[PDB]
Amino acid sequence: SGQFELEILSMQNVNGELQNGNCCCTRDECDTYFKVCLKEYQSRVTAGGPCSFGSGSTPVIGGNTFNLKASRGNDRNRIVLPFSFAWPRSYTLLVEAWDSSPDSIIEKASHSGMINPSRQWQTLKQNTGVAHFEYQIRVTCDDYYYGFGCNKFCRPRDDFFGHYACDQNGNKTCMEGWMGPECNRAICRQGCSPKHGSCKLPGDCRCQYGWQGLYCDKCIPHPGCVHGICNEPWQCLCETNWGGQLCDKDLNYCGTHQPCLNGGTCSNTGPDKYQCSCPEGYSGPNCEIVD
Ligand SMILES: *[C@@H]1O[C@H](CO)[C@@H](O)[C@H](O)[C@H]1NC(C)=O
Ligand SMILES: *[C@@H]1O[C@@H](C)[C@@H](O)[C@@H](O)[C@@H]1O
């Protein structure tokens, strides 16, 4: 989730002394190493206290005086303090220069401040006292982590869980045809019924039971429906001159069949039924008999 990094830049111990006053002076060279303690911001800085955000120490870097400003900074001259919590922005940093081979302090430093995730280094100096030392600090985010606390996670996906890439703010930007916060809801065919149509995959309008068409907006009439319509699934509402549950009964056998012959007037009597009114010199149920 994140790392606080500390790099040693330089040490200047001209006299090759210690914090007490003793020598590690042409007797011997100081075996200079660094101890680091990182905790919560303190308005009134304590010497002790637990190192809540991390503790660490370097192996022997150099002698009495060394300059690493033009050098790279490797596993030996730097300390990495990782963190899984949200970066609180504010911190209290304790950096100490120590001599190896009983161990005793050379110079002690403390710094209370505020820092945001950034690859850019912040140089800090210990100018007071006999021994002078420089160092640089920074807080960087781990891969897929965003925000001021290096706590916002975003990894691009094109699978079961989502189809998106990540913003500069670690916000999900949906792939074409996807929507929602997790970018896992497919965008249906343009015109697809909001009531009876649904997705699974982009531009694929799947019909609700009893609905049909390219847009799932047309009801399926009751099976066996002839001369009837529907507004709802399984309906079979008859058109003019049609009757019955399935709209199969002809209520206008007259306008259909035209049974009366030689210009006679036809009248209805219900399901497939008629009546003929015959002209001059005509007889029969269908006015077929002349005279
Ligand atoms: C975009 O990122 C900002 C900052 O993290 C957040 O407050 C906002 O809710 C995000 N927008 C969306 C749509 O997720
Ligand atoms: C209906 O009745 C028959 C007898 C004819 O006169 C037709 O012209 C009429 O429309």
Numbering used by the authors: 32 to 55, 66 to 142, 148 to 337
Sentences from the paper on this structure:
Signals are initiated by extracellular interactions of the Notch receptor with Delta/Serrate/Lag-2 (DSL) ligands, whose structure is highly conserved throughout evolution. Here, we demonstrate that the N terminus of human Jagged-1 is a C2 phospholipid recognition domain that binds phospholipid bilayers in a calcium-dependent fashion. We expressed and solved the structure of a Notch ligand fragment consisting of the full N-terminal extension, the Notch-binding DSL domain, and the three adjacent EGF domains from human Jagged-1 (J-1N-EGF3). Our structure demonstrates that the N-terminal portion of Jagged-1 folds as a C2-phospholipid-recognition domain with strong structural, but not sequence, homology to the Munc13 C2B domain (root-mean-square deviation [rmsd] 2.7 Å versus Protein Data Bank 3KWT, 10% sequence identity; Figure 1B; Cho and Stahelin, 2006; Shin et al., 2010).
The C2 domain packs closely on top of the Notch-binding DSL domain without altering the structure of the DSL-EGF1-3 portion of the construct in comparison with our earlier structure for this region in isolation, and therefore extends the near-linear domain organization (Cordle et al., 2008a). Many missense mutations that affect this domain of J-1 cause Alagille syndrome, a developmental disorder that is usually associated with J-1 haploinsufficiency, and mapping these mutations onto our structure suggests that they destabilize the hydrophobic core and prevent correct folding of the C2 domain (Penton et al., 2012). Sequence alignments with other Notch ligands suggest that the C2 domain is present in all mammalian Notch ligands, with conserved residues mapping to those that play key structural roles, and residues exposed on the surface of the domain being more variable. Since the strongest structural homology of the J-1 C2 domain is to calcium-dependent phospholipid-binding domains (e.g., the Munc13-1 C2b domain; Shin et al., 2010), we investigated whether J-1N-EGF3 binds Ca2+. We first used a limited proteolysis assay, which showed that Ca2+ (but not Mg2+ or EDTA) protects the J-1N-EGF3 fragment (but not a J-1 fragment lacking the C2 domain) from tryptic digestion. This suggests the presence of previously unrecognized Ca2+-binding sites, occupancy of which increases the degree of structure in the C2 domain.
